[PDB]
Design a binder for this molecule. Sequence first.
Ligand SMILES: COc1ccc(F)cc1C(C)(C)C[C@@](O)(CNc1cc(C)cc2c1cnn2-c1cccc(C(=O)N2CCC[C@@H]2C(N)=O)c1)C(F)(F)F
Lengths: 245, 9
Amino acid sequence: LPQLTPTLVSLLEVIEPEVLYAGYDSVPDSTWRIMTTLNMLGGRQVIAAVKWAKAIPGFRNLHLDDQMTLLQYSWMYLMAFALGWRSYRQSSANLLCFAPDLIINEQGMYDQCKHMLYVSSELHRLQVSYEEYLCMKTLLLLSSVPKDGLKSQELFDEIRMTYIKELGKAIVKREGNSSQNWQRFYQLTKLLDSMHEVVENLLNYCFQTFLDKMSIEFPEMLAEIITNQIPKYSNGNIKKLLFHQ
Amino acid sequence: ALLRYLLDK
Ligand SMILES: COc1ccc(F)cc1C(C)(C)C[C@@](O)(CNc1cc(C)cc2c1cnn2-c1cccc(C(=O)N2CCC[C@@H]2C(N)=O)c1)C(F)(F)F
């Protein structure tokens, strides 16, 4: 009867984007089209990411400029993580599960494949649950802020601190063993921190492909976000929030 | 702008 009264996590559970497909089984397996498809697929997921974002309780109350900044700051974190989680669940941290119709064995993407597979195995190692994953993924949306601060900053930190407690409750709803909980919080939030370092190695490759491009097809949504962030990343206007400072 | 419109839907 009071299972009717929804928690914040059951809410996060029902707004998770639906699976998307590369549209991919012409047939030859070339660099250009695989990269191009991944570009096109990353567009749709960023697009997904936004609808998702705009459903996260608290994300609404923040300023529109505050909403844009966070998505342009976190978009690569959300994909890196999501990919990890899927590769974790579909193939025990061993394969790179972009979509059902696109399962990439190692093979270019060395730095990428390595770093991406790390995330996945860490999820596999910790054996993260779905509620855990949901809270953790929302936290990644709130992973970085402008150094000059968000307009709705005071509000931002209120909401972010709320979603930590939720990842807390996810651990508690999982078991509540002992100091086992403490240790789990430690290891989970540590993983979130490593995300900062992983996304950087992924964000550069992405720029290098975007700029050094030679020819390669890119969607509107990514192009903008990319072109718009390069000067933000380049000038140091970003402040990476970490759990273990 | 592209992102902007999408957030303002
Ligand atoms: C990143 O640099 C590269 C590194 C290695 C490469 F092989 C290629 C690149 C390129 C730069 C050349 C091209 C990329 O296309 C790479 N594409 C992707 C990267 C990553 C890390 C994940 C990706 C893609 C494409 N889908 N998923 C993906 C898989 C699973 C989930 C999600 C995802 O979004 N979820 C989170 C929010 C919504 C959705 C979800 N609700 O679960 C995305 C480019 F990102 F566009 F730049």
